[PDB]
Amino acid sequence: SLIDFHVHLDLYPDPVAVARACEERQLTVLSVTTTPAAWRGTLALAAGRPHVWTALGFHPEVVSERAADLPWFDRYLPETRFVGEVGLDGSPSLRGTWTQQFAVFQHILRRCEDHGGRILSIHSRRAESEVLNCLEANPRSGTPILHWYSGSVTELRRAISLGCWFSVGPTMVRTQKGAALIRSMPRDRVLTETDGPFLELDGQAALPWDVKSVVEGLSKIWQIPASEVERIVKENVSRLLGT
């Protein structure tokens, strides 16, 4: 069975339909949030749905516009073992928000430490070195998963050294640079994701079950059968939960 360990169920036009479809497939999803204020509404998608695992987040792209939602993060942290989407984004269009992004992410890591550590699904686009500096400074924040890692191989080697895990998606398994990044990752720290509906495949928003294509992609890169890839990813989720 399949795992999509970073997906925005709450950003689909009909989130309940997507959640139901995941349950029908017994497809485990990490349902991430973009502001902690979204917790109650997005958590509700998981009621009666044991394959929907909801994460408490604050996405770097919305830290300015949703600044006042920050106190809901600490409020709800006791209700989940999963934090995401959180992190930093180095895109020029967000650069004026950099101080606020850093403040929020540092706050989040510190609160995670204070509550005994969490499993983190982390955004690092164009800010990989800065994300790693933050994680190195806050090692007791928990287990960091770098979602859709797109930085350098130099930075990837450092992330591995810092104990990062990786969730990899459709674009990564289908590109030269992505396949090269995957080859440097320890297989026991690789998870699969879609990042739907943000990720588009063939001009259409990805759905969680498009993660079958990531498993197929990894089968080719690792040169093992898709079933063994599925087993390894499940084993990896079990081990992750053990951390």
- Site residues (vs Mn ion, CB under 5 A): 85, 195
- In the bound state with Mn ion, the residue whose beta carbon lies nearer, of 64 and 219, is 64
Our CB check for Mn ion shows the closer of 31 and 97 to be 31
Closest distance of CB 196 from Mn ion, Å: 9
Closest CA to 104 of 142, 164, 59, 149: 59
Q: What's the closest the beta carbon of residue 105 comes to Mn ion, in angstroms?
A: 15
Whether residue 85 is annotated as binding a ligand: the answer is: yes
Angle subtended at Cα 75 by Cα 134 and Cα 102, rounded to the nearest 5 degrees:
25
Judge whether 8 is annotated as a binding position: yes
134 vs 199 by CB, closer to Mn ion:
199
Nearest-approach distance from CB 224 to Mn ion, in angstroms: 28
Known binding residue 123? Answer is yes
Cα distance between residue 197 and residue 114, in whole Å? 32
CA distance 185 to 124: 17
CB of 195 or CB of 210, closer to Mn ion: 195
**How far apart, in whole angstroms, are the C-alpha atoms of residue 172 and residue 23?**
26
Residues 160, 136, 168, 125, Cα dihedral to 10°: -130
Least gap, CB of 168 to Mn ion (angstroms): 13
Count, in order, helices (H) and strands (E) of the chain. Answer: 10, 10
Instruction: Give the residue with the Cβ less far from Mn ion, 195 or 230.
Output: 195
Contact of 122 with 147, CB cutoff 8 Å: yes
Shortest Cβ distance from residue 205 to Mn ion (Å)? 12
Give the sign of the dihedral formed by CA 61, CA 67, CA 68, CA 69: positive
Structure tokens at 178: 């992505």
Q: Are 171 and 178 in contact (CB under 8 A)?
A: yes
Q: Is 115 annotated as a binding residue?
A: no
Query: Phi and psi dihedrals of 146, rounded to 5?
Result: -85, 110
Q: Would you say 85 or 155 has its CB closer to Mn ion? A: 85
CB of 234 to Mn ion, least distance (A): 22
Q: From the annotation, which residues make up the binding site?
A: 6, 8, 85, 123, 147, 195
Q: From the annotation, which residues make up the binding site for Mn(2+)?
A: 6, 8, 85, 195
